[PDB]
Amino acid sequence: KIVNIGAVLSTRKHEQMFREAVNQANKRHGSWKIQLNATSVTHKPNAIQMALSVCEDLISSQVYAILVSHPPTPNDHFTPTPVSYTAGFYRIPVLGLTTRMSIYSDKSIHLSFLRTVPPYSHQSSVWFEMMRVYSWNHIILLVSDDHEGRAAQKRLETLLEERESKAEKVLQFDPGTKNVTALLMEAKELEARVIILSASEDDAATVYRAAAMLNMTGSGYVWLVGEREISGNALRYAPDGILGLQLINGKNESAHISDAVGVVAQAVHELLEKENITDPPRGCVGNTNIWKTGPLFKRVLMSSKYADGVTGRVEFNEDGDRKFANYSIMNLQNRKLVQVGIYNGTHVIPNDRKIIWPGGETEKPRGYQMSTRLK
Amino acid sequence: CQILKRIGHAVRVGAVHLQPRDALLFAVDNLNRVEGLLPYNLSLEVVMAIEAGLGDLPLLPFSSPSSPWSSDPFSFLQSVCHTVVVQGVSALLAFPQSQGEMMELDLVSLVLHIPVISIVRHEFPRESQNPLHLQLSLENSLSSDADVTVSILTMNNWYNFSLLLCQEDWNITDFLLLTQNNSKFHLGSIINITANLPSTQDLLSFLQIQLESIKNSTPTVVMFGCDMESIRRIFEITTQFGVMPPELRWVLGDSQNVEELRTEGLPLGLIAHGKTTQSVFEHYVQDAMELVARAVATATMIQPELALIPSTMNCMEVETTNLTSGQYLSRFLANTTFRGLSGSIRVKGSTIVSSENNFFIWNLQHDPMGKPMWTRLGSWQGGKIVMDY
């Protein structure tokens, strides 16, 4: 039998690294009846033209699994979308190394797909403990009108409902907003000064610009943001000591490809040992029916767990959401982010370096404002 | 005026067969003979894009061995695009007999920027999310038929129910899933009528034992995958020992044809369910043509200029248009839903054309002459059942 691992990557360096990893997988694996083949698909700069290229190359070659690469643009869900659409329901799951979008996790479209990295909402499951550890009896949330933002808000609400907390108020912002100071006006009415918001740099930049003039970044006020707005154009007016979160190994495309190849090497050996081991469908249009090996292949693939790759502790399961990933917390100090906290994906293990609250406060802020004007 | 004169005040629909002319002609005649189907006095016409070259339509029967289709799809796509441009077909109707043919039709529709609806006998796993191409399945999901039977469980208030299977390989998964949806109903003993019994005395004894067991357990019984002869034999065996209504309620969980549902030999008060009519490919073609005409009329009511003239004026040159005529028609088609000849056709997931067939439920009760006869209890559409009386 011939086993081919098609991959859609950008630049010749990624293709060469993938080919080298595929070649080394054959030597690192004891299988002798299974050969490793390397295929490179350049990122076509056309959504319509990608389908024909994928069908005539990936589908025709009958390769096993398709690798997706991050789009060259800073934020564009086009490169992984064609990969997930061309070979979505054809019993050929597609692996995305940097699929951090929270929308593509409900399995409504392109069911046979997996995420090699946790989404932005996934860190929310670790944020609640980060909120639980640092007191934070009452906090205020702001979610933009985005699918990823809505999913993150739902995950945070589910996490908070364990302790029966309504998170005070959650302001429904919108993407592309340039002036949310008036909407933030109702935020000043809330006694709690903890702001938890997960949006793009465009939506966060306006809020950051409006807060400083509103004196909302002073002592006793805590602003919490995600990794998407941690870096980018939103950091121009970000107050110092902003409690942001970052994910370790966030740009190790070669390491992710190597880990995927290592997982596939064992997956192929596991799959080629049972009855009804049908070959992958052949041809772009030659196939006229769904593959016989359907859910069994996906179940076998989503069951491996070993100490492989730089990240290690690969336990991909459930709908395909990564878990137990290293998180680096860096606080902006004079427009410079220095990693001061390390979370092993289970509990916070911050370094000995101290943390200063926004606006020039070294003490731990309190999110309570009593002595209100009772009427 | 200008749009009607340019397009001839007629709407053309393309028909391409990979390997239905009478059905298409009947659909066109039905659409044209009905007033109000299209606005601005638009008449429906059908244009066939066959593999043959350009030429006058000859009324001579030609019998020659057609060669297999070439492996190159570029020539076929170019020919289809040229035919669409020449005929100005708003929608191209495909008849793919395989998933590869359906994918080729979808690719042709995407290249030509026109909506293509492909008729398929059975639904297939579609991975493409392009809204331009749609697939209409002639055969609906079997669970919907069970949804009729479960409708009885949702209308007859028979919490205690039993299932009788004349075959071991019956697809009772749909019926079980439908019954387990509501907690009001309950599932009783399962009756399996094995066909391997050599002696009829043993079968009669087993039937009597099952009837005695289910008399004090469930007042309603549903037959799943029971043939007409098998159901008649079971009813006769039950009536031999005196097991008749209203001691137990008899329901046909499987599809039952009206023609073959003979009144004689059935117990009084028995309940049967069946399709309103035999949904032939002609009925599906007529429903698809009616939906296409309605979508074209809706598009012309807002943008007659774009609806009349397709935006794909070049078979090789593609224009970067944010909203084309094909997308404009596809939006209306996804927003289109009507009660067709083969059933209520609607759009699910913006990519599936689902034709929910109206299931008629009838009860074998007293007729005007006093003999047993099938009285239509009611009709169910989309899972909602309304009694006739």
UniProtKB/Swiss-Prot annotation, chain A:
Q: Which domain of life is it from?
A: Eukaryota
**What are the cysteine partners in each disulfide bond?**
55-284
- What ranges are annotated Extracellular (topological domains)? 1-375
What outcome is documented for mutating residue 193 to W in this protein? In NDHMSR; changed glutamate-gated calcium ion channel activity; increased inhibition by zinc
The protein's location, in the record's own words, is: Cell membrane; Postsynaptic cell membrane; Postsynaptic density membrane; Synaptic cell membrane
Query: Which residues, renumbered to this chain, are glycosylated?
Result: 37, 179, 215, 252, 276, 326, 344
PTM comment: NMDA is probably regulated by C-terminal phosphorylation of an isoform of GRIN1 by PKC. Its phosphorylated state is influenced by the formation of the NMDAR-PPP2CB complex and the NMDAR channel activity.
- What job does this protein perform? Component of N-methyl-D-aspartate (NMDA) receptors (NMDARs) that function as heterotetrameric, ligand-gated cation channels with high calcium permeability and voltage-dependent block by Mg(2+). NMDARs participate in synaptic plasticity for learning and memory formation by contributing to the long-term potentiation (LTP). Channel activation requires binding of the neurotransmitter L-glutamate to the GluN2 subunit, glycine or D-serine binding to the GluN1 subunit, plus membrane depolarization to eliminate channel inhibition by Mg(2+).
Assembly and oligomerization: Heterotetramer; the NMDAR subunits are modular and harbor tiered domains that function in concert to regulate opening and closing of the cation-selective ion channel pore. Forms heterotetrameric channels composed of two GluN1/zeta subunits (GRIN1), and two identical GluN2/epsilon subunits (GRIN2A, GRIN2B, GRIN2C or GRIN2D) or GluN3 subunits (GRIN3A or GRIN3B) (in vitro). Can also form heterotetrameric channels that contain at least two GluN1 subunits and at least two different GluN2 subunits (or a combination of one GluN2 and one GluN3 subunits) (in vitro).
Give the domain section of the comments.
A hydrophobic region that gives rise to the prediction of a transmembrane span does not cross the membrane, but is part of a discontinuously helical region that dips into the membrane and is probably part of the pore and of the selectivity filter. The extracellular N-terminal domain (NTD) is a site of allosteric regulation to modulate overall receptor function.
What does the similarity note say?
Belongs to the glutamate-gated ion channel (TC 1.A.10.1) family. NR1/GRIN1 subfamily.
Name-wise, this protein is Glutamate receptor ionotropic, NMDA 1
Q: Which gene encodes it?
A: GRIN1
Swiss-Prot record, chain B:
- What PTMs does it carry? N-glycosylated.
Where is this chain's protein located in or outside the cell?
Cell membrane; Postsynaptic cell membrane; Postsynaptic density
Glycosylation sites (chain numbering): 41, 160, 171, 181, 192, 322, 335
Q: What is the effect of changing residue 269 to R?
A: Found in a patient with autism spectrum disorder; uncertain significance
Q: Specify the superkingdom.
A: Eukaryota
Quaternary arrangement and interactors, per the entry?
Answer: Heterotetramer. Forms heterotetrameric channels composed of two GluN1/zeta subunits (GRIN1), and two identical GluN3 subunits (GRIN3A or GRIN3B) (in vitro). Can also form heterotetrameric channels that contain at least two GluN1 subunits and at least a combination of one GluN2 and one GluN3 subunits (in vitro). Does not form functional homomeric channels. Found in a complex with GRIN1, GRIN2A or GRIN2B and PPP2CB. Probably interacts with PPP2CB. No complex with PPP2CB is detected when NMDARs are stimulated by NMDA.
Which protein family is it in?
Belongs to the glutamate-gated ion channel (TC 1.A.10.1) family. NR3A/GRIN3A subfamily.
The protein's job, in short, is: Component of a non-conventional N-methyl-D-aspartate (NMDA) receptors (NMDARs) that function as heterotetrameric, ligand-gated cation channels with low calcium permeability and low voltage-dependent block by Mg(2+). During the development of neural circuits, participates in the synaptic refinement period, restricting spine maturation and growth. Forms glutamatergic receptor complexes with GluN1 and GluN2 subunits which are activated by glycine binding to the GluN1 and GluN3 subunits and L-glutamate binding to GluN2 subunits.
Name of the protein this chain belongs to: Glutamate receptor ionotropic, NMDA 3A
